Amino acid sequence: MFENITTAPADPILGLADLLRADERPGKIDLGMGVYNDETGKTPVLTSVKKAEQYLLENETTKNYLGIDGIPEFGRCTQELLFGKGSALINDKRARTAQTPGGTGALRVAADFLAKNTSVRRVWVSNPSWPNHKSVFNSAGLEVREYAYYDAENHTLDFDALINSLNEAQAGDVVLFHGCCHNPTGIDPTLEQWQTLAQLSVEKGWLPLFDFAYQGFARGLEEDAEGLRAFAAMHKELIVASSYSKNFGLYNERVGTCTLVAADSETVDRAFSQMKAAIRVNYSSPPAHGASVVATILGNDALRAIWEQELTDMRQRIQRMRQLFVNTLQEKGANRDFSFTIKQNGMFFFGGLTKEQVLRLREEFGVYAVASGRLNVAGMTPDNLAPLCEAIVAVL
Amino acid sequence: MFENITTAPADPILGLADLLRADERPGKIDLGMGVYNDETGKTPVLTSVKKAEQYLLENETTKNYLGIDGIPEFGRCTQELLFGKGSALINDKRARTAQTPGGTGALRVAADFLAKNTSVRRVWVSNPSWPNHKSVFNSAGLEVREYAYYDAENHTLDFDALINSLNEAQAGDVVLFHGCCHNPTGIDPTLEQWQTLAQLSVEKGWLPLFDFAYQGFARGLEEDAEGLRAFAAMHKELIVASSYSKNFGLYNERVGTCTLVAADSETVDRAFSQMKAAIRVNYSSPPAHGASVVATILGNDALRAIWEQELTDMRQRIQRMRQLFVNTLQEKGANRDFSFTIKQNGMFFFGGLTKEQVLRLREEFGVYAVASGRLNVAGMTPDNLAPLCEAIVAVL
Numbered sequence: 001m002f003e004n005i006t007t008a009p010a011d012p013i014l015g016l017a018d019l020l021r022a023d024e025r026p027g028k029i030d031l032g033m034g035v036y037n038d039e040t041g042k043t044p045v046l047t048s049v050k051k052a053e054q055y056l057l058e059n060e061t062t063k064n065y066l067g068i069d070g071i072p073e074f075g076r077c078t079q080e081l082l083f084g085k086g087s088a089l090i091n092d093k094r095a096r097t098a099q100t101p102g103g104t105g106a107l108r109v110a111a112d113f114l115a116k117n118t119s120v121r122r123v124w125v126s127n128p129s130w131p132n133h134k135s136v137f138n139s140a141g142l143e144v145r146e147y148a149y150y151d152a153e154n155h156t157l158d159f160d161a162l163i164n165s166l167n168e169a170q171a172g173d174v175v176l177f178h179g180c181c182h183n184p185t186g187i188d189p190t191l192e193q194w195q196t197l198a199q200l201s202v203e204k205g206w207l208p209l210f211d212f213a214y215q216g217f218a219r220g221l222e223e224d225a226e227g228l229r230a231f232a233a234m235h236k237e238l239i240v241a242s243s244y245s246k247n248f249g250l251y252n253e254r255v256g257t258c259t260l261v262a263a264d265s266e267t268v269d270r271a272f273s274q275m276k277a278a279i280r281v282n283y284s285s286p287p288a289h290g291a292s293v294v295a296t297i298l299g300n301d302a303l304r305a306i307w308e309q310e311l312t313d314m315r316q317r318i319q320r321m322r323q324l325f326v327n328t329l330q331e332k333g334a335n336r337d338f339s340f341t342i343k344q345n346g347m348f349f350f351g352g353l354t355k356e357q358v359l360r361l362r363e364e365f366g367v368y369a370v371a372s373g374r375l376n377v378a379g380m381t382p383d384n385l386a387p388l389c390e391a392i393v394a395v396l
Numbered sequence: 397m398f399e400n401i402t403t404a405p406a407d408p409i410l411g412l413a414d415l416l417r418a419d420e421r422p423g424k425i426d427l428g429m430g431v432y433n434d435e436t437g438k439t440p441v442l443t444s445v446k447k448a449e450q451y452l453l454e455n456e457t458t459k460n461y462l463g464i465d466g467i468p469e470f471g472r473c474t475q476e477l478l479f480g481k482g483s484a485l486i487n488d489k490r491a492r493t494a495q496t497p498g499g500t501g502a503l504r505v506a507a508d509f510l511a512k513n514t515s516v517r518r519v520w521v522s523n524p525s526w527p528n529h530k531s532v533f534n535s536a537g538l539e540v541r542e543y544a545y546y547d548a549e550n551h552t553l554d555f556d557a558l559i560n561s562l563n564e565a566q567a568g569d570v571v572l573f574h575g576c577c578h579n580p581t582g583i584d585p586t587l588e589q590w591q592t593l594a595q596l597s598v599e600k601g602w603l604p605l606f607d608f609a610y611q612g613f614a615r616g617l618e619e620d621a622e623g624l625r626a627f628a629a630m631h632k633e634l635i636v637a638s639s640y641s642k643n644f645g646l647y648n649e650r651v652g653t654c655t656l657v658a659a660d661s662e663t664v665d666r667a668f669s670q671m672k673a674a675i676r677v678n679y680s681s682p683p684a685h686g687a688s689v690v691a692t693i694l695g696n697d698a699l700r701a702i703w704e705q706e707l708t709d710m711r712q713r714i715q716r717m718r719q720l721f722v723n724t725l726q727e728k729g730a731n732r733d734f735s736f737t738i739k740q741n742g743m744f745f746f747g748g749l750t751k752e753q754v755l756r757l758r759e760e761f762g763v764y765a766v767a768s769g770r771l772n773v774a775g776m777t778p779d780n781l782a783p784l785c786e787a788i789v790a791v792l
């Protein structure tokens with residue numbers, strides 16, 4: 001059976017781990033996949049998380065199955081994080097949330113749900129976008145089309161091009177939006193632009209699908225939810241996929257959610273039953289640990305206080321790092337000005353390097369970054385900043 | 397979009413949780429889904445597990461992503477549990493194992509892998525079988541056909557009918573086998589019958605797919621692996637899906653594996669790259685916690701000793717319970733003799749009740765069991781045995 005099977009091409013993000021693993025050079029700088037690193041270059045488990053874990057260790061009395069949608073408390077806490085304490089969706093009971101295996105599992109579940117329960121055929125993804133988006137939707141059988149977003153020249157959001165290209169999007173099409181910290185550009189639409197998109201969306205009849213993987217990394221939990229909320233106020237239906245991998249540093253515990261919003265509770269329930277069926281035939285029920293940790297923290301005011309402060313520290317370190325980054329590039333003699341990097345939200349740097357420039361970086365300097373020219377700023381430390389900037393300047 | 401969506405029918409196993417949840421009657425007896433209960437009717441977290449968890453709490457220094465296939469140590473430990481310490485497959489490097497979200501995730505990953513990378517169109521499942529088997533394969537696009545297995549009259553394995561029906565299975569077809577403790581019959585083929593199936597399999601050109609969810613619940617870890625090993629000795633290719641939900645009591649942490657066996661390391665590697673691609677587009681990487689707990693136990697001889705003893709206790713309690721069950725039914729005046737139940741391996745009782753008899757049981761007695769007449773013996777306790785037998789006798 002397996003004689004003619006072809007070797008699958010390496011993942012553009014995950015594939016870096018292996019190349020890196022095989023590179024015996026000591027001064028390796030890993031700026032590839034988007035995980036947070038502290039000043040020492042380690043990606044530690046948050047103190048709020050450890051505390052939640054001791055709590056679980058001491059009070060967990062069973063490991064019995066979780067129920068297709070997972071921990072109820074977890075689902076409710078995420079709904080308020082997303083829609084807000086007194087959201088109409090919560091009080092009208094128009095939203096049903098399922099605990100999933102990470103943000104990716106959330107996208108896969110939505111896709112399987114859509115592909116088999118609605119007439120959705122096309123999904124619109126921004127150009128550029130997280131590489132795995134196309135893959136996830138295509139494996140579900142959906143056609144993926146792109147819409148303009150980034151302006152390589154001005155390093156901004158080309159709003160007109162976006163609007164124009166989305167005019168080809170027909171009613172019933174799914175349009176995928178990054179909630180905040182757009183991966184990989186880091187350019188997000190203003191609240192005003194979000195409001196314009198919301199109304200255009202309702203008018204054209206698109207089915208909004210929000211991908212929220214970095215809530216709290218741009219400005220703050222609530223502020224980062226602004227776009228979605230402007231959308232949640234005018235739409236009858238929505239799908240929201242979120243991740244807690246990054247904002248809770250629980251990458252490998254696979255914590256995420258998939259929320260369905262419908263005109264009313266009766267419809268959301270019928271629709272949700274089909275999403276649970278799509279889950280049962282995939283992984284059955286979600287992993288408890290990571291979500292328990294999230295529900296405990298969010299549910300306990302003391303632990304929540306520590307957590308929110310940890311997130312704040314994470315965001316602030318990245319902000320300081322990208323500023324220092326630009327400054328060091330200046331003193332190292334960088335021919336090109338990288339000031340725009342400062343206007344980018346999240347963990348990444350994008351727009352100043354070419355595919356060949358990044359190949360040369362790993363090739364002779366051992367600096368690893370995504371081939372698209374995307375660098376993980378959250379991976380730069382005061383110690384590696386200088387060697388890093390010297391390599392980049394030698395490449396420009 | 398969601399206006400015409402139909403309500404999905406409740407799961408035959410998982411659906412019991414909800415009915416049960418809505419039944420306010422106090423003397424409810426839950427003999428539905430297959431989870432272990434101790435003498436007190438609780439499904440506790442094993443002591444070996446708690447200890448592994450404290451270890452992790454104290455020594456885990458990061459939560460960084462796990463890599464598509466998961467924890468390497470975990471993969472190796474499962475290979476020896478399955479194939480044996482000095483298995484040829486291990487030493488010739490013909491097997492590649494991926495950590496998955498439970499046994500169900502293992503079946504789904506294999507199915508997606510098969511559907512898109514080979515010419516597999518049909519999968520043969522026993523009659524009867526775990527209900528979710530058909531669903532998993534159908535959602536991947538594969539046609540599912542059944543083969544005879546159980547003899548409702550004699551309460552045995554109708555080996556000739558099985559052989560006969562499998563003659564319709566063509567080369568290149570996948571044939572699914574339960575490693576041990578066949579769900580729901582509890583009837584497993586003798587080692588001699590396994591050897592006959594292995595040779596017939598090689599001769600006809602079937603692609604064996606083993607589902608191992610109860611290793612250690614029939615006779616012992618090694619003994620329960622006999623069938624698979626007789627198959628692993630003659631086959632060039634195989635697929636094995638296993639679960640640690642039941643034998644480690646880690647139901648909600650979603651711990652399982654999907655192992656690929658090929659003629660050689662070069663082919664298994666090409667094939668495995670495609671399985672990782674199928675994973676990346678599903679949930680990306682597996683949940684660490686549950687598998688870490690399994691790798692720690694299996695990797696530490698002291699913890700392993702405690703664990704193996706806990707499994708032994710679990711198996712022994714079920715054995716005592718089904719014997720006491722038959723005995724109590726005798727003294728309660730059961731018209732029908734249920735001695736055959738004693739020849740069944742695993743957690744279940746199957747073959748003595750009809751769909752209506754089980755409906756009447758929940759209906760007026762509050763005894764919950766699967767509509768197929770499958771009862772979870774591991775859920776019977778000395779306390780509920782009497783009330784349980786009185787209801788059954790009142791129903792016969």
Ligand SMILES: *Cc1c(COP(=O)(O)O)cnc(C)c1O
Nearest residue numbers: 102103104130183213243245680
């Ligand atoms: C990280 C990320 C994801 C993945 O979520 P996981 O929890 O890692 O599966 C999804 N979408 C975007 C945009 C991301 O950045």
Ligand SMILES: *Cc1c(COP(=O)(O)O)cnc(C)c1O
Nearest residue numbers: 284498499500526579609639641
């Ligand atoms: C329990 C069971 C499974 C499910 O494995 P999970 O770890 O619960 O997903 C798969 N197959 C059989 C036969 C089972 O009994």
